[model samples]
Target: SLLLTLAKEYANLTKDKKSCKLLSQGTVSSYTTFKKWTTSRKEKNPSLRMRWAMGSKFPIMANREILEEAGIPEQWEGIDLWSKKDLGMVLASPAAITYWNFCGPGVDNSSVIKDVYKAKFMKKERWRETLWGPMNFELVGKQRRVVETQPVEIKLNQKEIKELTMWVLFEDEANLASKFIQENFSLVLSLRELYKGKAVNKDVAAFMIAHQFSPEKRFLPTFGPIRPERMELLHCLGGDFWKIEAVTAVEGFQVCEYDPRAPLIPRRDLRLIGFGKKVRVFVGQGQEKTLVRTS
Candidate 1:
């Protein structure tokens, strides 16, 4: 409702008749069709299929641009830049994959990770203490039973890896997608308005309508990674050092003043020092225990 209201007001403010009409129309009918297709589980409706088709084209175009800029051929014989059915296989660049494993799913939350890294590893010895300690501790323990020791490794040509990494980092596909939405904002809002009263998920319906209107446009929400600065920082750290630094920084930090209602907007700022209570440390055993603040 808020988005529709905002779209209508924006259209009125700009005296844009096209946007106003579209917003007023809404997306009920398209949503109903989509719902029917979803229920049957046989074939996707045209709207859903169009979205997937548009989304898939982005990586291909972006990969091409990145390779051309790098003075590499746009089409490599053995390397499959496009037409790879699985995205996991498509994004098999060593650095990107390694970074994903290091950061987990919240790899998108780069700012917090950067600050945490700085807090923990600004000093040199802290990194050594953090890394060697756990490694040595693990070696002393009895080896656990192996579940599956071997895993298949997918190999890519070195040039392919380079192109994929460039696409992941340098290409601003999110901005490109956002720009598409911006250019067609009025039309998208107009369609949403047209179907507003008929759809349960009006937002999705509006998006589908927009996709139908502009099948060639990209619609990737996950194309962008964390901030560029943080990416550079990770790149500089390299190898196992980045992993150890990230873990150390996370341990020293605590999130506060966060509001679930507005998850993206921070209610209050987080600071590296004097803002959070010092992390507690345990020493010795039995009643002769000692507590220390590891800040």
Candidate 2:
């Protein structure tokens, strides 16, 4: 379903030349050309893995347009501003402005800082690395003078948000976990050193193993830097199956078990519950968690 959704949404890119060019970085002359390139990648990996070139700014540019197309609000009151450029203004600190024009507008307010903070509050978070370059340098006869480059802004729309969530479903860590479990399907993954670096904990590894056995080919909404509120949210969303106890006694590790039968809330519903107001949803144990306010 995730792959199908990705293919369908990617096909939608052909309708707009600007969006197509932005995604293709001017390499593709038309939708047919774009489709060919995408088809090549799709053959290699059904997920259609295409690397965004450094300094291209494709994600922000394309994601904004896609999100708008998905009918997600361009600006959520406290979440985002009217424009991607507007984000710079809200996040710029006074000390950062002292360098003034050295790096350009809000250069000090990079997306890394913003996203790190957002990870603390946002229910679902994805991390991406990008390159910034072409740092201007002055050749003063013999010596070179380095000039600062302005900070870049990153934004995402609903479609991009969904894309990220779907990407997490196929993360290497989970895949590795699945492989290890499948190899030892008859055995329990209780070894800390064995599955080290492959999973957060043994229970998580176990969960991945269980996930592989199920017919459902999906993942629950995932995030980084687990917080207390997030734990509460997980418990609320995943009832009896979401356990916080040790699966093994000698190792003394705790993992959360999620039942495949109980599907995760839709991305839109999850976001609304976490970041929106007056949202109503039945959570774990069939308990109602209504949102009257947002952070």
Candidate 3:
């Protein structure tokens, strides 16, 4: 059975979670099956726990402080609240920083414009677009220097495209980032292949099957001004099960459950199927409800 094969694989691999990351990923499927297996085996060994924590210890073995520090936002607008260096934090390229001016000394709080830097990055088929590339900064030293240039679109060179393609295909075999890029790009390639009626690569097909399906987020701002009520904070202490079970399993948890006649949450009843195509896995579900077209 697949469970036995995976259990053996999990046992043979080194105990280091990072070293056996793929095996750790298999744990959920193994345990889910094992949960049922043990339920059947419960008759013989009533107290058996079925080694549920076999691959689990690795995931939680990391330094919590390091992870938390890594997650802290680097910059928002002109504010630099983070203690970490802002220059070297990004994995890919830097975003485009657009500057504007008003008739004042300080940053014209009213006219600060921002846009992502576009360059040749991951533009493969199945994978999502990455808003990372070279940054264009026009700084005014000490004097009031006024300069303006239309946003120029730079195309990715053949070499950069090949580098990005390889990065997407096989980046993550032994190396971490490489593997991640490979997995993502592989999916994109596979999706494109599927679109063309070609055979899907097994590894890419497996990766696609293993991922969770969730709603997408759009970047629409709230009316009036951004406020706390406009934001929704979802917290779950007991991990994925608790979070999924609570929101989806509970009554009136879905946005579609909203009243149609007298709307409590406007457009809450609208079903946005496959509307999360724009979000990148690395970026995550930012500012929930940011819709993107799937078709």
Candidate 4:
């Protein structure tokens, strides 16, 4: 294998100064041979998991400091792939129960939904459709939403209607979610304000199940939302976004150039972005569709 050849050559060439004695760090099987990797960047972006599996041998594959010091080419290249595979499905937030728990084993979802909010004046829900795949006319409903957290009681008829009636014509979730949230609205308020009864094409219901969960396009954090610049590196490496736990959470996604059959070499010019000290870990890089004016 190319990796083995590279390992043997690396040991032979740099055997004197590279310090394979103590540097083996208990991860190397032999004094000359490094740990092996079952995964590679050929499938997608070079995996952090692969590096973890590599233990101390990761520098041979790709590392900014070590590769630059050794002056070698990267073992692989970064490729963006399959980031949004779980969108609108499992792993939804407390709000996105609609997206994940929509239809399962004939289970009841309304019971699962009752806890997210309180029943106040029947607010007029709105759905703003400004977008999708193979469609026609778009929907633009009310943007204002009224979602309360405390238990409330409604007055008699001669009372005032506080809820804003948003005639929903659902198409999607991103723009509206981004739109309302840009104005500092809650995820529930943005999604709850829409009339989710109407859906077009093959959709069973508009934004019914996912409700506020729809359109987040993010792995929401516990303290607050994901940072703006946090998504930058993923955009650069074509990586996907995941539920972020903290702002300090960045990942060391490597840069390599591994392919099936190319004239193998001792090493390639390799590097790393968002190394350990800089970035931690999260998801949500590239999405499915966007910037459209279709149905």
For each candidate in turn, the TM-score is 0.17, 0.15, 0.13, 0.14
Least well predicted 10-residue stretch by lDDT in candidate 2: 246-255
Query: Model 3 residue 34 lDDT?
Result: 60
lDDT of 3 at 30: 68
Error of 3 at 38 (Å): 11
Global lDDT scores for all candidate models? 0.34, 0.34, 0.31, 0.29
1-295 in candidate 4: lDDT tens per residue?
A: 7577988886687666446445544444453444554455475645875566545322222223322343323223532111123323212122122322442135455733443331211121211221113322333222222222211232212111111122123222223233333323342346445444322231323223323222223332222222333322223222133222222321113223333242222112112322222221211222222111112
Angstrom error of the Cα, residue 41, model 1: value is 16
Looking at model 4, report the run of 10 residues with the lowest lDDT sum.
156-165
Better of 2 and 3 by lDDT: 2
Alpha-carbon runs more than 4 Å astray in model 2: 1-103, 107-177, 181-295
lDDT of prediction 2: 0.34
Q: Taking the tens digit of each residue's C-alpha lDDT, what string does model 2 give over 143-168?
A: 22222111112232223323222223
Runs off by more than 4 Å, candidate 4: 1-110, 113-182, 185-206, 209-277, 280-283, 286-295
Query: How would you order the candidates by TM-score, starting with the best?
Result: 1, 2, 4, 3
Residue-by-residue lDDT tens digits, candidate 3, 1-295: 7577888875777777775664545555665766566445335653354344333322122233433443433335653222332333422111211111221135333311211111111112112421223333332122222221111232332233334433344332222233434544555465444333325463543333221111123343222222222222212111222222122110111222222242222222334433433321111212223323333
- Deviation of model 2 at 56, angstroms: 22
